[PDB]
Amino acid sequence: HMRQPIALISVHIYVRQLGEALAAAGWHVDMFTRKTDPNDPDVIEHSPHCRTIRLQAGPLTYIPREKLFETLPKFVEAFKAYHAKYGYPLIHTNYWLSGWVGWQLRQQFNFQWLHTYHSRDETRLMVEKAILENADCVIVTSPQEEAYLRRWVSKAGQTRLIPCGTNWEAIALQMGQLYRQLFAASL
């Protein structure tokens, strides 16, 4: 629908399943995550318009989320080689760490930026505030996490409820609709 090459970013199963259901509905989807082994493949094609791209960004090993922040400037540089060619009009970031990447990108480029929230503290809170303030839309997966965000992080920004679940077709349809809403708001 609406506008073509979209990028989902998950530095660290939410994104993999979303992008495949999105592409089933017709979106051209490139999903980016980090490499965690030097024998990892660079591109995994799932369908003619859906693939996962694994970027070398920090050590070629499994790094847990609580140690990933320092790898993000490298993830931004690796991603910028793909964004330099594909020019993604929409980028959808997953978890606050990928959102830092989205935040850095949005400071340099003009794209529709959506972010999905999920539930060191000093860094996370400042970054989560920056994302809420500058992203076009932040997705929460339950009222309880929306309640937490508004209580403990910030009241700023636009949040939308797309609930946790195992029906990825349904989720993708709701996400797709948001994408198109964002794109039409160009006026």
* Cβ atoms < 10 Å from Cβ of 80: 14
Q: Which domains does the chain have, with CATH numbers?
A: 6-185 (3.40.50.2000)
Task: Give the technique used to solve this structure.
Answer: X-ray
Note whether 101 and 93 are within 8 A (CB): yes
Helix ranges restricted to H, 25-142: 72-86, 95-108, 121-134
What are phi and psi for residue 137, nearest 5 degrees? Answer: -155, 135
Q: Which amino acid is at 131?
A: I
Report the alpha-carbon angle 7-21-127, nearest 5. 40
Residues 6 or more apart from 31 whose CB is under 8 A from it?
7, 8, 9, 10, 15, 16, 19, 50, 51, 52, 53
* Cβ atoms < 10 Å from Cβ of 12: 16
Helix axis angle, 95-108 to 72-86, nearest 10°: 50
The two beta strands, 43-47 and 50-55, are antiparallel
CA atoms within 13 A on the CB side of 130: 18
